[PDB]
Amino acid sequence: GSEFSAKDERAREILRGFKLNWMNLRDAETGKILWQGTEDLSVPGVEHEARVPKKILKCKAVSRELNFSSTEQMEKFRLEQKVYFKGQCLEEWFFEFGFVIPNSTNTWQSLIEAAMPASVLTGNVIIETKFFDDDLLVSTSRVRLFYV
Ligand SMILES: COC(=O)[C@@H](N)CSC/C=C(\C)CC/C=C(\C)CC/C=C(\C)CCC=C(C)C
């Protein structure tokens, strides 16, 4: 039993004012779109799914582009992602956007390098994402991946 702090309140404000507008993945060797979403995969407390083309597992590198809106100002917007296959953490990724202007829309591109078959991976891979503003944890969200 504790206070609902100033940090608890601001983390809640950032979450209620944040939306992921769209996202896509491009083959980094061709610049061509492999997968697009408009579903907000950022939303915590819902068990999200993504159905990506199995040919993605072939790519040496993919670029990921996010477009997001934030009513609240953020000093250092950043993501930590862990990739799980049946509970084993296979990858740990860090991406930094930086300062977010209040009531702004923003585009963010990152590069992911391909560090087992689609038959086995499909439905057994979870990406867990932690959304921070510096050291304030705003949300934790999870996406189960399928290769189709
Ligand atoms: C085994 O699968 C692989 O990852 C290999 N193909 C190597 S790499 C390719 C990239 C992929 C498939 C991972 C893309 C990531 C996804 C679908 C998760 C997107 C989630 C977010 C960007 C988090 C959204 C949350 C916010 C903004 C708070």
Numbering used by the authors: -2 to 112, 118 to 150
Copy text verbatim from the article accompanying this structure deposition.
RAS is a major anticancer drug target which requires membrane localization to activate downstream signal transduction. Phosphodiesterase 6δ (PDE6D) has a beta-sandwich immunoglobulin fold which contains a hydrophobic pocket capable of binding to the farnesyl group. PDE6D binds to and sequesters the lipid of cytoplasmic RAS and has been proposed to deliver GTPase to recycling endosomes, which is followed by release mediated by the small G-protein Arf-like 2 (ARL2), allowing RAS to be trafficked back to the plasma membrane. The resultant lipid modification increases the affinity of RAS proteins toward membranes, where it is required for signal transduction. Here, we present a novel strategy for targeting RAS by stabilizing its interaction with the prenyl-binding protein PDE6D and disrupting its localization.
The only conserved feature is the modified C-terminal cysteine residue. Indeed, the affinities of 13-residue C-terminal peptides of WT KRAS and HRAS for PDE6D (1.3 and 2.7 μM, respectively) are comparable to those reported for full-length KRAS (1–2 μM)29 and RheB (∼0.5 μM). These affinities are also similar to those of a carboxymethylated geranylgeranylated cysteine residue (2.7 μM) and a carboxymethylated farnesylated cysteine residue (0.9 μM), suggesting that most residues preceding the lipidated cysteine do not affect binding to PDE6D. Interestingly, in addition to N/H/KRAS, more 4 farnesylated proteins, 10 geranylgeranylated, and 6-double geranylgeranylated binding partners were identified.
